[PDB]
């Protein structure tokens, strides 16, 4: 089955990424912005530079240069799991327990987590 509402519609227009230079929120001003939908950009006011490691033997050689720990499974995020990704109110309230999946992305007054 398809849920009735696309997640983009459960996000408030004031929270979607900015679409003009007038609506730049604090992080868009501090870190900068580029419009993904047309013209518009702003160079960020915060610049990170001169990163240096102070320790010399900082990397963990596990014992030989050819060792390698196999690293669990980093699976892909799956927002179809509405009980994890969807919220009952645009304040980000988790969904109620016990309701069937048809409830997930249901009302327009639902929200994202």
């Amino acid at each position: 089955g398809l849920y009735e509402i696309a997640p983009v519609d459960l996000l408030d227009e004031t929270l979607k990424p900015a679409t003009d230079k007038k609506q730049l929120s604090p992080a868009d001003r501090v870190f900068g912005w580029v419009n993904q939908r047309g013209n518009g950009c702003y160079k960020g006011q915060l610049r990170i530079h001169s990163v240096t490691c102070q320790h010399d033997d900082a990397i963990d050689d596990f014992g030989n240069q050819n060792f390698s720990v196999p690293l669990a499974i980093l699976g892909q995020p799956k927002p179809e799991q509405a009980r994890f990704y969807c919220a009952d109110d645009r304040k980000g309230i988790p969904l109620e327990d016990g309701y069937d999946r048809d409830d997930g992305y249901s009302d327009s007054e639902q929200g994202l987590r």
Partner: protein, 171 residues
Amino acid sequence: ATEMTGNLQPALKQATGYPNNISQAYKVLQPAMHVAVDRWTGGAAEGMLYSVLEPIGVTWEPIQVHLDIARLKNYYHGKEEKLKPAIALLLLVLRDLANKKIPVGYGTNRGMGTITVSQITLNGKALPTELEPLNKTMTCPNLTDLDEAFRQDLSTAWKEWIADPIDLCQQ
């Protein structure tokens, strides 16, 4: 090259001058990968994967700036008193360059572009006698290698212009 882990590796080993030693090759030109990470899901935003060939270890020759004192002096209708605000400005710009305040090139806010200045050499020819103290090699970023009397003279002419920032070439 078309495969970052494939035929690109021979090409960079060639160009960096370590045709048999990639771990030295990638101390000169290093490919970087970046992702945009979607704010609700994590992972990566669909389509937003990109890579940079970062010249992490390319060494660069000294930058040459040529200041035409004759051309300024013509703009100021000869008055070498009027050079000091322009010379004062230039030395303030160079002070910031040496203090990492002027990054250069692409991606300055995105992990590139910050330079260390080791030495500024000032080498003028036929400078007017009151600017003759410029002929110097400086290694302190804060210009402290220029004579304090000269830096204090420039500061005075500069401050006198700040107090009235006229169009200095207006005769």
